[PDB]
Design an enzyme around this catalytic site. Structure first.
Site, short mmCIF file in Angstrom:
data_model
loop_
_atom_site.label_atom_id
_atom_site.label_comp_id
_atom_site.label_asym_id
_atom_site.label_seq_id
_atom_site.Cartn_x
_atom_site.Cartn_y
_atom_site.Cartn_z
CG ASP A 1 -1.74 1.29 1.34
OD1 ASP A 1 -1.30 2.21 2.06
OD2 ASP A 1 -2.81 1.37 0.72
CE1 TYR B 1 1.44 8.47 3.07
CE2 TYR B 1 1.76 6.27 2.16
CZ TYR B 1 1.07 7.14 2.97
OH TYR B 1 -0.01 6.68 3.70
CG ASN C 1 -5.12 9.73 1.69
OD1 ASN C 1 -3.99 9.67 1.20
ND2 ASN C 1 -5.38 9.27 2.90
N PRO D 1 -0.96 -0.30 13.66
CG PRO D 1 -0.01 -2.40 13.21
CD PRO D 1 -0.19 -1.02 12.63
CG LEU D 2 3.23 -2.13 16.39
CD1 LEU D 2 4.68 -2.45 16.14
CD2 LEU D 2 2.70 -2.94 17.55
CD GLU E 1 9.97 -8.17 17.99
OE1 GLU E 1 10.90 -7.43 17.59
OE2 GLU E 1 9.50 -8.11 19.15
CG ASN E 2 6.35 -6.12 13.54
OD1 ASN E 2 6.47 -6.25 14.75
ND2 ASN E 2 6.50 -4.96 12.92
N1 LIG Z 1 -5.35 5.66 5.28
C1 LIG Z 1 -4.41 6.67 5.72
O1 LIG Z 1 -4.68 7.82 5.61
C2 LIG Z 1 -3.08 6.26 6.33
C3 LIG Z 1 -2.40 7.12 7.13
C4 LIG Z 1 -1.22 6.77 7.68
C5 LIG Z 1 -0.70 5.51 7.41
N2 LIG Z 1 -1.38 4.65 6.62
C6 LIG Z 1 -0.83 3.35 6.34
O2 LIG Z 1 -0.41 2.72 7.54
C7 LIG Z 1 0.60 1.95 7.26
C8 LIG Z 1 1.38 1.59 8.55
O3 LIG Z 1 2.25 2.65 8.86
P1 LIG Z 1 2.72 2.84 10.43
O4 LIG Z 1 4.20 3.13 10.44
O5 LIG Z 1 1.96 3.98 11.05
O6 LIG Z 1 2.40 1.44 11.25
P2 LIG Z 1 3.06 1.00 12.70
O7 LIG Z 1 3.33 -0.48 12.68
O8 LIG Z 1 2.09 1.32 13.81
O9 LIG Z 1 4.48 1.80 12.97
C9 LIG Z 1 5.51 1.09 13.61
C10 LIG Z 1 6.79 1.97 13.68
O10 LIG Z 1 7.50 1.65 14.73
C11 LIG Z 1 8.70 0.98 14.36
N3 LIG Z 1 8.59 -0.44 14.58
C12 LIG Z 1 8.01 -1.37 13.81
N4 LIG Z 1 8.15 -2.56 14.41
C13 LIG Z 1 8.82 -2.36 15.55
C14 LIG Z 1 9.23 -3.23 16.53
N5 LIG Z 1 9.11 -4.66 16.73
N6 LIG Z 1 9.89 -2.78 17.58
C15 LIG Z 1 10.17 -1.46 17.70
N7 LIG Z 1 9.77 -0.60 16.73
C16 LIG Z 1 9.09 -1.06 15.66
C17 LIG Z 1 8.99 1.21 13.10
O11 LIG Z 1 10.05 2.25 12.91
P3 LIG Z 1 10.79 3.04 14.16
O12 LIG Z 1 11.52 2.06 15.05
O13 LIG Z 1 11.80 4.00 13.58
O14 LIG Z 1 9.79 3.82 14.96
C18 LIG Z 1 7.68 1.69 12.46
O15 LIG Z 1 7.90 2.83 11.77
C19 LIG Z 1 1.48 2.82 6.35
O16 LIG Z 1 2.29 2.05 5.58
C20 LIG Z 1 0.42 3.52 5.49
O17 LIG Z 1 0.26 2.81 4.19
C21 LIG Z 1 -2.56 5.00 6.07
#
Ligand SMILES: NC(=O)c1ccc[n+]([C@@H]2O[C@H](COP(=O)([O-])OP(=O)(O)OC[C@H]3O[C@@H](n4cnc5c(N)ncnc54)[C@H](OP(=O)(O)O)[C@@H]3O)[C@@H](O)[C@H]2O)c1
Ligand SMILES: NC(=O)c1ccc[n+]([C@@H]2O[C@H](COP(=O)([O-])OP(=O)(O)OC[C@H]3O[C@@H](n4cnc5c(N)ncnc54)[C@H](OP(=O)(O)O)[C@@H]3O)[C@@H](O)[C@H]2O)c1
Ligand SMILES: NC(=O)c1ccc[n+]([C@@H]2O[C@H](COP(=O)([O-])OP(=O)(O)OC[C@H]3O[C@@H](n4cnc5c(N)ncnc54)[C@H](OP(=O)(O)O)[C@@H]3O)[C@@H](O)[C@H]2O)c1
Ligand SMILES: NC(=O)c1ccc[n+]([C@@H]2O[C@H](COP(=O)([O-])OP(=O)(O)OC[C@H]3O[C@@H](n4cnc5c(N)ncnc54)[C@H](OP(=O)(O)O)[C@@H]3O)[C@@H](O)[C@H]2O)c1
Lengths: 106, 328, 328, 106, 106, 328, 106, 328
Positions: C52, C57, C125, C212-213, C299-300
């Site tokens: 996605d 971006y 969006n 989710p995180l 891990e995820n």
């Molecule tokens: N519909 C919309 O308007 C919209 C808006 C926003 C996003 N999205 C979608 O949401 C998707 C998910 O993005 P998200 O980054 O917000 O999801 P997220 O999983 O909640 O973000 C996790 C962040 O924390 C860190 N991380 C990931 N796994 C980890 C772990 N085991 N341990 C420690 N840190 C970890 C990663 O980098 P760091 O360690 O540097 O923090 C990652 O950036 C995006 O790809 C986008 O396509 C959609």
């Protein structure tokens, strides 16, 4: 303001009526005969006027325009409901007087 | 207020500035190509994104020079709104009207001359009595669905014809028009003010007015006579010269002197007041301008400053001076 | 259970895995191209087929590097699901919104940057107040019928707007949307749990949840402060750093310590429990992940093992610890 | 839960009725006023609610919502059929009491 | 031959009725309950059955299937027209006997 | 009578011969390319214009060799009827079913392998429980309207599913299917004889039957055992060899001896009587044949002579011998 | 001039009736039975005949063609309105005589 | 009056002259290419814009030479009206009729032979009993919507079939036909005069009549016998020679002598009176001519002068001489 030729669709709670514009603009002082008063009931997506009201009362209202001014209450409609419909559609004082004369006690 | 203040064209999602630049007599005719490029650069740098042309202007040649600016300066296609008008295409019998064949062939020839893939709005320049409305609405829906245009509108149609086109489009599940081009200035007030608000409130059709200075009459340059290098002194404009030098023109010049006194009291010029007078109501979306040099365009852009100064007292004083307010 | 266990997106015929990979901050920004290729190879070799992205971006640059992976490794087009989001396209007035012109031009520019012929789902969006719903639904139906997309969906819309889009599509014999993208984690629970099941049972619109995180909060890395090379320490993310270092963040960290004790009792880690908590109900079709290196992605991916261990007692204990269950 | 603005189409054996949602959600304890109870009659391909039931009885049911609570049996419908329709559409005990008071023997 | 789920549209001189197939196949010995007898009235271009017959009589015919077997003549329809409709739709001998018992002289 | 005697496929305007040639096990597998070219030339010179293939046969390779005949001999495209079947396209999750994405991608890949611009009929090989009917009918209408096909039909569907597809097509103003492919021989008689005439009389859907010789059982070659270079002795056909060598096969061989006595009384062979028995009613439009060499095809073409000799007495005698007539 | 097979749609003020052409051309001397007289009411955009007239009176007019010549006034329609409808649709002198004989005083 | 006097074809927006030039026996057959180019130049310089051909004429070769004129002289496409007729395409079974496959393939082959992108009107040459009307109307709507044609019409259809096509087009929201080609001269008067005015007044279908001189009979050249280099003396026209030399032909020649006396009284020739007699009513839009050399075409163009001289007395005298007026 010739007001002729076009076809008008009126939707009463799902029941559809069709007429001509020169039938409606014989009485310009009513709700349906005045474009300024009926413009708030227009539906642009379906090209019709919509009223959320009583269904068996509108046949007599349409026959008032089609017959030239005759008021006749339907058999299955009570007095007060038809009086409220005449008051809503703004047919005038003389239509109320003719309805009172045609129904006995008036 | 008007330019670099954007509003929807009718009730659609297309957003335009309220000043546009026209492609009549000057382009391909009276002025040169370098002056046209200078005028387009000066219009684009001030936030104007609306440009309007037609296939009958200068035998199509004006459309050619419009393309020669757009490919030269390298502007993005997504930041421009280009409109065209189609009624007259040639001397043959099948090269005019609003039939399906001429609409498709004229739009293809206009897109070939403009060096573009599509236009934004395509207008019908005048109504056609020999064609059914269903054929015209189906041809407009066909050229929209092929990607050659985005929207369509009318020009010089009456209210019954626009309502008939809307009714035919709703009957057969087709595309209704969004806009109407009408003439509107201080001596032509009937159609915009008494007929079009009902169509705007009912079916959401907007208005895009043309000739705000009455081909230069309300600018006030003809107070003495016919100056050289004007539109009235050109070859082929004897009707405008006869209209200026008649008996109604002197009364128009006296009323223009009184309006010039009002505009000089407000701290502006008479063309700025005349342009900003047309945008005082919400039924008008945009005003198409005409200019012959850069000083006229830079003066005409400055009506944005004089638009918010129009109170009800100044409007009532202007209506008392003019004395032609239509009854409704 | 989630990845390499496939399910329908809503009630449509498109089948996706329940873990996807996102193209936010890392791609084109924080990480390099070789790390992005390694993450895409590691995601593809474990059965993930959902990717996605969006046109906003990294000024579109992330989309470019996505194409540079797909043409390089030679994967088949029929085994991938690619989605894009369109609202913001530039600084001009006509380069944003949900009008017909910007939808067609933005989808063409995104397909040009991705080096593809079509995408699978195209999302809106955010909702647009200046455009009628009929124009947006007709533009989405037009780009589906031209072969530039297969399906379309919404993002950050309310239930009334989705129901209005369905009603407009059923009125004019057009294409209804199939999916909604919403935010869902342990501290954002209202919209997915109390509003979307009615739309899933009524008109069959599925949900595809993101973050989710909580941008790394529920991973538990901010128990002391702000570590280097994190998302909160980057330039332009002062809002996340202020959200972490406020007074609610300490209560969130204490609840995260209790949830980490539960997850260590179950034999897993806290991000695996947080990811697998979102997939416990049938209204959610897929969860989009974000990762910065290969260890985080490996891990995820391991939440599949901890998904079937979630009984009703552990869910009730988690709801007793969190204390934010919405009333319905 | 403002429940306003949207138009609702109800299909009784081929006979179509149209109303607004704020007419229906004046009485939230009935079948048509509750979204949890009417959701099993929804047709997704046609955007309507379908009932395979008696056609002349539904005009009085719709006028009960439109008039604010008045029950009046149609002339061409018997007593027990209209009682079964009132029992199906779950209008309540006080609507049954008003129907018994308006029809003599109750 | 479960005969359930599908919706059937019946067109009587422009008046449209909709029902389910399990309502119709409760009585397999009639015209509408037998697929071999109603197949000559099917219209393939419109997906409906068309009858060029009397319009106010069909509501009682549909209520015979919907109520489980009760015959009640409408008020505005004469005796012989309704008897001819019962004879055309092939409801049986016991439906004619119930109609004679419900109408006095039989 | 059957070949070079043409009839409408259902109630549509497409006219086919009642013998066709199939592209199962032999093409790309058992036989070579020169034998396939000889079989196609022998079929085309006798008036057969119907050829049927699928994307699952020999991993698609059979389709490739079909194209290598048509481009070689230089036949006109307007004198041929080519059909394809689409359900199975690969090992990935999104490469099977009757969704919109797989229908469009599979038809494009099959047209790329066949070196053609369009096919005449495209079939759905089996029903799909995970896809709504509206999506399948809209995808078939879309690929017909893009010029990639002319008609579409079903295969191995029940009567309720065909009636549901017709009802969905009539509801949304789409294209209904025209044909159904079913299995029909002397030991498989139920579906063609008791279910399909109602659909032919009601909505005009015709039948195109396959396997008339029960993969070679009714030819009578297995009266002793399993001869070499047969279909039952090939690798991967253990099910057919177990079906022949079971206890029901001996009763089938005894009934085949009695039917061979009847066919030798009529002056013909048993495969000619078995092929011409399937075309005795008007509900069957065409019969698809399979052959392994030129002598088998030249024998199977000769059922045209034995078709008009089938009186009611011979049909009643065959039904008395077989004893499996379905009750209706 | 076999006049058979085709289906004809007649629109009375929004109320739609459908019939066959061989039902209409049993009486060639009336308004609906003659193609020269009904051609001025044809609508080419919708393929129907439109009349801006009284809605409950047309069921008896259609049953006059469908039953073979029987005239029966509806209960809810007065005498003079139905007489004006019989005069408009040009049913003839013998239909007026049968209507006078069926209604008492004639 | 007829040529360089334009009128609408039916009630549509297409405007044609009332004289056209046909592409039967002469083109590709009897005459050479230089004579055909001379005839087309002489027709185009007098204001005739209507040219009619078919795919069955001279095995298609006539269509080829029509293209070889249009590309040679460099005329504009927008000033010409080109029509084609499609029923017969070859000797195979699938190369004839009005099915979808043959309509698409025949129109593509005719556009390939004509070296054009589109035609204006495409006609069905005769009705097809083996095809449903819905398939034919959908195929015509499909080839109009792909840009391969602008309008469509019928030829040799009855009134019930045209009304059925109109009813099917109005039922499924498709395109109705606009024109009918019928035979009309002084000895063939029934169908144009008693059947087609009802269709013109009801649904607006116009008429385009062919063979005004009855293949040269009403020209009066066969008063003695069969002259050399005529159509009756060619190979393959024994039916016309038997029709001339029968017993009805002598009565036709005597009536032609009386009509020649009337035409010599009016100051004209008999073919000019015969051509201008067909255009005396408003139901006929155009008349298609045939000519073998330039003198015949220059004589046939001169009926424009004798058209306004036809009063009611001369028409009544002609109807008294002919004695075949149909009763209505
Ligand atoms: N519909 C919309 O308007 C919209 C808006 C926003 C996003 N999205 C979608 O949401 C998707 C998910 O993005 P998200 O980054 O917000 O999801 P997220 O999983 O909640 O973000 C996790 C962040 O924390 C860190 N991380 C990931 N796994 C980890 C772990 N085991 N341990 C420690 N840190 C970890 C990663 O980098 P760091 O360690 O540097 O923090 C990652 O950036 C995006 O790809 C986008 O396509 C959609
Ligand atoms: N829908 C239709 O059918 C239709 C028809 C006609 C035009 N239009 C549109 O209308 C648009 C406007 O054209 P228009 O020329 O009629 O508008 P205009 O503004 O009323 O014309 C002003 C004319 O006066 C002169 N002028 C401009 N500013 C001046 C100033 N400050 N002082 C003195 N003179 C000034 C200019 O040249 P000069 O000094 O040489 O006079 C200009 O030609 C055209 O571009 C065309 O696209 C549409
Ligand atoms: N709709 C579907 O899903 C589906 C499924 C399967 C097939 N089909 C179609 O059915 C078509 C027919 O295939 P089929 O092979 O099953 O039909 P078939 O005619 O019943 O098979 C006959 C087999 O027996 C042998 N044979 C043929 N003629 C013979 C003769 N005179 N004497 C002895 N042996 C003879 C041939 O090879 P051997 O001698 O080596 O045995 C041939 O393979 C296929 O082409 C395919 O297009 C459709
Ligand atoms: N819709 C259909 O199915 C259909 C069928 C047939 C034709 N058509 C159309 O009808 C059009 C007209 O063809 P047509 O030839 O039958 O029309 P025509 O005008 O009746 O034929 C006249 C013939 O007589 C000769 N002639 C012409 N002018 C003459 C003159 N002043 N004096 C003596 N002879 C003269 C010409 O050659 P000769 O001297 O050698 O005789 C010409 O071939 C064709 O082009 C075709 O497009 C349509």
């Amino acid at each position: 303001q010739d007001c002729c030729g076009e076809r008008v669709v009126i939707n009463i709670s799902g029941l559809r009526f069709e007429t001509q514009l020169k039938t409606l603009c014989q009485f310009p002082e009513t709700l349906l005969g005045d474009p300024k008063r009926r413009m708030r009931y227009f539906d642009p997506l379906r090209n019709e006027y919509f009223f959320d009201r009583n269904r068996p009362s509108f046949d007599a209202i349409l026959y008032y325009y089609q017959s030239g001014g005759r008021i006749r209450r339907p058999v299955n409609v009570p007095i007060d409901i038809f009086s409220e419909e005449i008051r809503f559609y703004q047919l005038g004082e003389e239509a109320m007087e003719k309805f009172r004369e045609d129904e006995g006690f008036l | 207020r008007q330019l670099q203040f954007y509003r929807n064209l009718g009730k659609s999602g297309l957003r335009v500035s309220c000043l546009g630049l026209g492609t009549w007599v000057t382009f391909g005719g009276q002025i040169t190509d370098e002056m046209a490029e200078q005028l387009m650069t000066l219009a684009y740098d001030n936030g104007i994104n609306l440009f309007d042309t037609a296939e009958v202007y200068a035998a199509g040649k004006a459309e050619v020079v419009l393309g020669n600016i757009i490919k030269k300066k390298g502007w993005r296609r997504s930041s421009l709104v280009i409109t065209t008008k189609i009624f007259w295409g040639g001397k043959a019998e099948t090269e005019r009207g609003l039939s399906r064949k001429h609409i498709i062939e004229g739009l293809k020839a206009s897109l070939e001359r403009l060096q573009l893939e599509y236009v934004d709005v395509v207008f019908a320049n005048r109504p056609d009595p020999n064609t059914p409305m269903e054929e015209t609405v189906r041809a407009m829906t066909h050229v929209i669905n092929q990607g050659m245009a985005m929207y369509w509108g009318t020009s010089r149609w009456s209210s019954m014809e626009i309502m008939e086109a809307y009714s035919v489009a709703r009957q057969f599940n087709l595309t209704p028009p969004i806009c109407e081009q009408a003439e509107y200035h201080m001596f032509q007030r009937e159609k915009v003010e008494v007929q079009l608000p009902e169509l705007f409130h009912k079916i959401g059709v907007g208005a895009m007015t043309w000739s705000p200075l009455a081909c230069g009459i309300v600018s006030g340059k003809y107070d003495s006579g016919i100056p050289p290098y004007s539109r009235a002194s050109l070859k082929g404009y004897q009707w405008l010269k006869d209209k200026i030098l008649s008996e109604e023109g002197r009364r128009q010049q006296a009323k223009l002197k009184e309006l010039q006194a009002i505009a000089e009291r407000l701290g502006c010029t008479l063309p700025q007041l005349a342009i900003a007078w047309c945008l005082r109501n919400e039924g008008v979306s945009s005003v198409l301008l005409g200019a012959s040099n850069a000083d006229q365009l830079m003066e005409n852009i400055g009506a944005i400053q004089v638009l918010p100064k129009l109170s009800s007292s100044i409007i009532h004083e202007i209506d008392s001076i003019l004395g032609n307010k239509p009854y409704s």
